[PDB]
């Protein structure tokens, strides 16, 4: 990767010198077989721009790699097909910054390659979606229409059905239109066909919706009048309460039912993933109800997927992301209930974990992540405040749900503050901007460009307004980690005493799940480790603190708690 980066620098400074040995490089690529998808999507992206800009041997290398693709359009090795297809899409990505004849040749090439095999077709559509999403700034409209005119015949010629049920009366299950449009009777025929789409394979159905969103975002600056009315689609599936039929264990239809509901759920995920960000009249509530619908769909997915002891869906419930159609960051842009917010923070937590510390989670810079989160955290903070008041007020279904939402959200703030990039001062300007936003939310006005330690104090008063309302030990520990992440690297005495007292009472705070069953486990152990390490780091007299813990903290546990805890510290137990 380092060598590809320096080759990129060489080609951007001057391509001509590279063209002296670019023939040898191309013959090398033709020779060895050690290709990897990312290094293809960079190498082919670099390799084609030289032919149509500079003229030393550009025609030779261009036609050489073209002929390589044509000869290996359907290679004996299977993976060469998909690396050739990603190479091709990055060629037309570079071209779409003439090539019309070569573009026609390669498009006919891939069309013959994607005759009926769906897997390569799904991969091709997914990579084209990646292309347009990465180069959204400027792609040629007329060339894209010349190439991507299949949009009008792909979706609204194969998955559009009349709203009334009049097709395939006798089938595996009756077709039932669930999650109907809010404003009924607005189109002649709006319903997507998946249940009769037993198999066109249903694998090539999710990424092409992202593709349609990008087509309508490129044809018009907005995304209306072509699919705007085509979002409220009563989704043509089986009966809703078929989960009661899961006891039958058909393994011939219920097994197909699992993939059916999986594809429909991925469809819905794209629906929220597509048009949430756009702001328009009479559609925000539709997005909210779609989010509630995907919540319910995950709920029904859980039982049916638990019933089957093994199943493999195509990438095109908690640890199921690789087989799941990934959600972007634009979903939280419109944060302006408990389960839906829990789901949103759940899929946000992994993203913030990876970006701030196929694999579509790995295509955004941490600085862009920071500017995006600071751009749209105001509704986040408003919801934080309201559900914090809810916690301040005091059945399991909402209490545990909101506790999990609280924990995930405070984990979000921790990894938004424990981001190791804060060591250098370059990003500290956006940090200061975020602290001014937070302090303005806490203290109205009179807080612009206050000094750093007083900003720490402002964050201290604000983020510890939520101190008294902590349902789970995870939330308390993660709040302490939030402050440790925002507190000065050279730890200051007032914060020393503050954190000493806070972690003292957290170790002294009882931790009780709503249905009994004290919050033990393995994640509990690691969180206790980190919290107590931070405490003993920030306690003033460390030796006195450990002496107290070992003199009154433990012996009560050793003499009283068979399964309970120490009286002074309910966090100490036989297990812990």
């Amino acid at each position: 990767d380092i060598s590809l980066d320096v080759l990129t620098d060489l080609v951007i400074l001057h391509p001509s010198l590279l063209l002296r040995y670019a023939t040898f490089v191309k013959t090398i690529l033709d020779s060895m077989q050690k290709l990897n998808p990312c290094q293809i999507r960079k190498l082919f992206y670099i390799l084609s721009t030289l032919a149509f800009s500079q003229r030393q041997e550009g025609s030779y290398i261009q036609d050489d790699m073209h002929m390589v693709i044509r000869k290996w359009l359907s290679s004996s090795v299977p993976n060469h097909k998909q690396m050739g297809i990603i190479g091709a899409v990055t060629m037309m990505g570079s071209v779409a910054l003439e090539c019309d004849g070569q573009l026609s040749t390669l498009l006919d090439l891939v069309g013959f390659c994607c005759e009926q095999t769906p897997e390569v077709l799904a991969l091709y559509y997914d990579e084209l979606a990646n292309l347009i999403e990465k180069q959204k700034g400027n792609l040629d409209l007329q060339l894209l229409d010349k190439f991507g005119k299949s949009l009008v015949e792909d979706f609204p010629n194969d998955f559009v059905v009349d709203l009334s049920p009049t097709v395939d009366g006798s089938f595996l299950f009756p077709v039932k239109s669930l999650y109907n449009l809010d404003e009924d009777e607005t189109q002649g025929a709006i319903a997507i066909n998946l249940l009769p789409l037993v198999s066109v394979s249903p694998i090539c159905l999710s990424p092409c919706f992202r593709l349609l969103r990008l087509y309508t975002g490129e044809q018009n600056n907005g995304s209306l009048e072509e699919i705007d009315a085509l979002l409220g689609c009563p989704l043509y599936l089986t009966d809703l309460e078929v989960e009661g039929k899961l006891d039958s264990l058909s393994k011939q239809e219920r097994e197909f039912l699992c993939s059916l509901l999986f594809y429909a759920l991925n469809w819905f995920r794209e629906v929220v993933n597509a048009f949430c960000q756009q702001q328009d009249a009479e559609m925000k509530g539709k997005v909210l109800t779609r989010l509630q619908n995907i919540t319910e769909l995950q709920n029904v997915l859980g039982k049916c997927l638990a019933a089957t002891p093994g199943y493999v869906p195509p990438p095109a419930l908690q640890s199921y992301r690789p087989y799941f159609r990934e959600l972007d960051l634009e979903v939280f842009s419109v944060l302006h209930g408990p389960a839906e917010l829990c789901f949103l923070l759940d899929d946000m937590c992994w993203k913030l974990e990876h970006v701030l510390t196929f694999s579509h989670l790995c295509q955004r810079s941490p600085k862009e992540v920071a500017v995006c989160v600071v751009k749209l955290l105001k509704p986040l903070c408003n919801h934080m405040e309201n559900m914090h008041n809810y916690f301040q007020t005091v059945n399991i279904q909402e209490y545990q749900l909101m506790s999990s939402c609280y924990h995930q959200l405070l984990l979000a703030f921790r990894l938004l503050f424990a981001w190791s990039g804060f060591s250098q001062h370059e990003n500290s300007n956006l940090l200061r901007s975020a602290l001014q936003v937070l302090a303005d939310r806490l203290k109205p006005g009179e807080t612009e460009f206050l000094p750093l330690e007083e900003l720490i104090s402002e964050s201290f008063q604000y983020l510890l307004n939520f101190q008294a309302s902590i349902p789970s030990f995870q939330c308390a520990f993660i709040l302490t980690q939030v402050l440790m992440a925002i507190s000065e690297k050279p730890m200051t005495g007032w914060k020393r005493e503050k954190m000493a007292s806070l972690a003292k009472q957290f170790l002294c705070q009882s931790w009780m799940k709503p249905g009994g069953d004290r919050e033990k486990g393995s994640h509990f152990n690691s969180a206790l480790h980190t919290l107590l390490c931070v405490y003993l780091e920030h306690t003033d007299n460390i030796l006195k603190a450990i002496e107290e813990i070992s003199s009154v903290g433990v012996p009560e546990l050793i003499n009283s708690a068979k399964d309970g805890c120490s009286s002074t510290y309910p966090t100490l137990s036989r297990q812990t």
Partner: protein, 948 residues
């Protein structure tokens, strides 16, 4: 059908898998080559497949890393990985510009491991016994060049690159690396035509900027390759002209050897001769000591570069250069006196001019006065400093006069003035001399050192005329008494004044100061003095023999000369660089040296010489041993066995003598003389055995109380019972005696008063022997680590010896750790060596891969013979050091953190060995710990009652 097969294999490797194809092809061509060696149609096809494979690795670079297979094969069992075709293939790929360093350092570690293995095998026949499989990479890598005589180009490039980095990586395994590199470079230069110019360019570019490391290899292989092929330099358009700048880097010996090497090409080529003469002409008048040394060194060679003894302007023009250079300092005046004879052996009238110049030089300090006050013009050689080495000039005068006399106006004058000087020294005693005071010398004084340089200069003056009178007179009593008077002046002024007030404060390790005699002269003197009695003897030696002080000097000079041949490769006087010449001289002087010893201190001197003749004979004249061995009057052993037998007779008589007649200096030399002569006894002789059983039986019987005598004799026994059998049998017996001789670790049970050797008494069991036994024990453990390394169908044989030896070795330490050792370094050695033998761990660690009953018995032995006894040692070393610590000033921190440091390390080694038993016990499903006992630790309690 082999070319089609290799074609389909590299076609498969180009696109498909490439893992096992290389192994198959290398194995097939290995068996093909092993058949073939037991021709052209095979060499051509092998070259073609080599080219195909190198093209494959060039285009498909992924077939070379799968180096890993060869490395794994070498690691599994060392040696059986560097097949001739495998090494040729990697050598061809070494010039690929990719993955060169990985392959190259793999070869470096493999070849250094192989040379170390060969060194160990030549140092241990027992390892040869249990590991007959030897893989000598030198031979196979010098066989490729033998096979590279069939148009191999990239193979030759790999060879030359490998050699270049071999000289690079040199800087004894490093010396062996130099030898291998010189060999491969010479072979690839001799047989490869179009690359020999490249080899010459590489060696010319490698010699420069290389002086810190010993770089004699460059000059010697350059001389070899130019004597094999002198036309290469002219083919390279004589690129040696740029090398003339080396007069400033290190022209002490490199310039001399370089000119020696390039002598024929300077002679044939006029341009290089002109460049040399001009560079030396501009160098001579440079006023730098180093530049002038380089200039005079080059002059020493250029005169003999041209030969006319059997273009006259060339002869006459060079005469005045050295005459002009004579005016410079004494240091640069030095070497011309020595080097004049070498060129004087090569001229007729140039010799006459050189004599005239030297005569004019000596007239400067002659003071012609006809037998009066001494002719000492040493005042001019004062600019505390010295301006002219009169002694060297006189020595050169005498030697050149002798040469001129032997070859066939001023010559008659030359003889008479030399005779006048001899008659003047005998009449000028230490009363007309200015240095009559017994203490005028004073170090670090402006006048004392002036006396010192005057004192040393006159000593050389006397010595030279000793040579003159002995040679000019032939059994003439008148000249013999002159020799007596000369040494009378010599001894009266050398024995006293100097080495009383001059420099004797430190005990003189050496003897009569640096002598300016001839190896030819001293040979004639001793041969005429001893082992010579004829009517031609004019009763002069009878009165000469009364001068026993002259006797001691007469041989001490010879000891000085051969010592020069010991430390360095040359000597002084005429014929100092013609190895055959001293070889004949050494062949002659040795007999009379032996005759003087066998005639019956004085004999102590000649015997010390013989030790140094034999030492020099083996270390320098290794190829010339058979003639020297036969010259003492073909198998060397029978004559060698004869030579030691007479030395054996001397020892048995001397050792059996009373303690009042032990003359320890004689015993050390004679013991060492056997340890040097016994080196060259061949392995396949019986005389090896009866001699070996003789030194054992002499050890069992004799009870010698000397320390160096016991140490020296034991080294001989362990330098010979190291190439015939396993020494652990001897070490155990020595340990048996040491434990019996000394007390016991527990001082409660009495060891039976056995005596396996009579040498070990109440005194010799001191570090004298206990450090040698542990020294040998460390050596045995060192090679066992190599065997364990090799162990990690031939594997079973390796494990048999190691378990058997370690079982015996454990019995050694078990009986040695129970010894009540005294304080000092002998305790410290045992504690550290015990830490070594436990690191038993590696053998256990290897067998984790597998259990055998023999290994279980070893741990049974180890648990019941080492660990419980080892901890008892620690409970004893704590009190012996407490007693030893009371004798402080009767800071101490040095002596408390130095006598106790081994103890924590020994504890760690025990537990680490103990820990890896846990891993084996669980994995090997057998509990092997019922044999041993629980680990024991120690605490303390500061006795506050006796605090003060």
């Amino acid at each position: 059908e082999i070319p089609p097969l290799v074609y389909q294999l590299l076609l498969l490797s180009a696109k498909g898998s490439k893992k096992t194809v290389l192994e198959g092809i290398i194995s097939f061509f290995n068996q093909l080559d092993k058949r073939q060696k037991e021709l052209d149609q095979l060499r051509h096809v092998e070259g073609t497949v080599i080219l195909h494979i190198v093209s494959a690795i060039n285009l498909d670079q992924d077939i070379g890393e799968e180096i890993k297979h060869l490395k794994t094969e070498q690691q599994k069992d060392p040696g059986k990985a560097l097949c001739p075709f495998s090494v040729s293939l990697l050598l061809s790929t070494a010039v690929k510009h990719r993955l060169q360093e990985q392959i190259f350092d793999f070869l470096k570690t493999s070849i250094t491991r192989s040379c170390k293995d060969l060194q160990i095998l030549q140092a241990s026949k027992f390892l040869q016994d249990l590991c007959p499989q030897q893989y000598d990479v030198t031979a196979v890598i010098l066989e490729v060049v033998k096979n590279s005589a069939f148009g191999w180009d990239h193979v030759t490039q790999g060879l030359v690159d490998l050699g270049f980095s071999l000289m690079e990586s040199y800087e004894m395994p490093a010396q062996q690396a130099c030898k291998l590199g010189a060999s491969i470079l010479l072979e690839t230069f001799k047989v490869h035509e179009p690359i020999r110019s490249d080899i010459l360019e590489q060696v010319l570019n490698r010699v420069l900027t290389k002086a810190a490391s010993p770089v004699s290899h460059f000059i010697d292989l350059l001389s070899n390759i130019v004597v094999s092929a002198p036309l290469v330099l002219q083919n390279s358009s004589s690129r040696v002209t740029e090398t003339f700048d080396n007069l400033s880097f290190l022209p002490i010996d490199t310039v001399q050897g370089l000119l020696r090497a390039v002598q024929p090409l300077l002679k044939v080529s006029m341009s290089v001769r002109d460049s040399l003469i001009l560079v030396l002409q501009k160098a001579i008048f440079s006023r730098q000591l180093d530049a002038r040394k380089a200039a005079v060194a080059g002059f020493l060679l250029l005169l003999r570069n041209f030969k006319i003894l059997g273009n006259e302007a060339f002869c006459l023009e060079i005469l005045g250069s050295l005459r002009r250079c004579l005016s410079q300092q004494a240091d640069v005046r030095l070497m011309l006196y020595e080097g004049f004879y070498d060129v004087l052996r090569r001229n007729s009238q140039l010799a006459s001019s050189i004599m005239e110049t030297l005569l004019s030089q000596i007239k400067q300090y002659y003071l012609p006065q006809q037998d009066l006050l001494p002719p000492l013009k040493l005042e001019g050689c004062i600019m505390i400093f010295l301006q002219e080495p009169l002694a060297h000039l006189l020595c050169c005068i005498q030697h050149c006069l002798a040469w001129y006399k032997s070859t066939v106006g001023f010559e008659q004058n030359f003889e008479e003035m030399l005779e006048s000087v001899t008659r003047r020294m005998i009449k000028s005693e230490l009363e007309d001399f200015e240095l009559d005071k017994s203490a005028d010398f004073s170090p670090s004084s402006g006048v004392g050192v002036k006396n010192n340089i005057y004192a040393i200069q006159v000593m050389g003056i006397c010595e030279v005329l000793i040579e003159y009178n002995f040679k000019i007179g032939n059994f003439s009593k008148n000249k013999f008494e002159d020799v007596l008077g000369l040494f009378t002046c010599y001894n009266k002024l050398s024995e006293i004044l100097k080495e009383k007030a001059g420099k004797n404060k430190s005990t003189l390790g050496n003897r009569i100061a640096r002598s300016f005699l001839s190896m030819g002269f001293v040979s004639t003197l001793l041969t005429a003095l001893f082992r010579d009695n004829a009517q031609s003897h004019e009763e002069s030696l009878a009165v000469l023999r009364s001068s026993t002080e002259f006797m001691r000097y007469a041989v001490s000079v010879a000891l000085q000369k051969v010592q020069q041949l010991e430390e360095m490769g040359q000597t002084d006087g005429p014929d100092g660089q013609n190895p055959e010449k001293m070889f004949q001289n050494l062949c002659k002087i040795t007999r009379v040296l032996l005759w003087r010893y066998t005639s019956i201190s004085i004999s102590l001197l000649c015997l010390e010489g013989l030790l140094r003749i034999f030492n020099t004979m083996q270390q320098l004249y290794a190829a010339r041993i058979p003639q020297f061995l036969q010259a003492l009057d073909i198998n060397v052993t029978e004559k060698a066995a004869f030579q030691i037998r007479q030395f054996q007779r001397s020892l048995v008589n001397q050792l059996s003598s009373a303690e009042d007649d032990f003359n320890s200096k004689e015993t050390q030399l004679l013991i060492t003389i056997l340890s040097t002569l016994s080196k060259l006894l061949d392995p396949g002789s019986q005389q090896f055995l009866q001699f070996l059983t003789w030194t054992v039986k002499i050890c069992k019987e004799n009870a010698l109380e000397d320390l160096s005598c016991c140490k020296g004799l034991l080294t001989l026994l362990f330098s010979l019972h190291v190439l015939y059998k396993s020494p652990v049998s001897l070490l155990r017996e020595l340990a048996q005696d040491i434990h019996a001789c000394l007390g016991d670790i527990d001082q409660d049970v009495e060891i039976e008063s056995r005596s396996h050797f009579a040498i070990v008494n109440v005194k010799t069991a001191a570090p004298t022997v206990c450090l040698l036994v542990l020294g040998q024990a460390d050596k045995v453990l060192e090679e066992v680590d190599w065997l364990i390394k090799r162990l990690t169908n031939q594997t079973q044989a390796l494990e048999k010896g190691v378990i058997l030896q370690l079982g015996t070795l454990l019995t050694v330490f078990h009986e040695l750790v129970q010894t009540a050792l005294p304080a000092g370094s002998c305790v410290d050695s045992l504690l550290r060596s015990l830490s070594k033998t436990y690191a038993l761990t590696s053998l256990i660690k290897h067998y984790i891969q597998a259990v055998p009953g023999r290994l279980e018995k070893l741990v049974k032995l180890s648990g019941s013979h080492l660990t419980p006894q080892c901890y008892s040692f620690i409970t004893y070393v704590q009190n012996i050091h407490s007693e030893s610590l009371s004798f402080a000033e009767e800071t101490v921190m040095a002596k408390v953190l130095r006598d106790t440091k081994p103890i924590p390390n020994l504890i760690f080694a025990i537990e680490q060995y103990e820990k890896f038993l846990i891993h084996l016990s669980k994995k090997s499903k057998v509990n092997l710990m019922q044999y041993m006992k629980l680990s024991t630790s120690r605490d303390f309690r500061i006795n506050a009652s006796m605090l003060d």
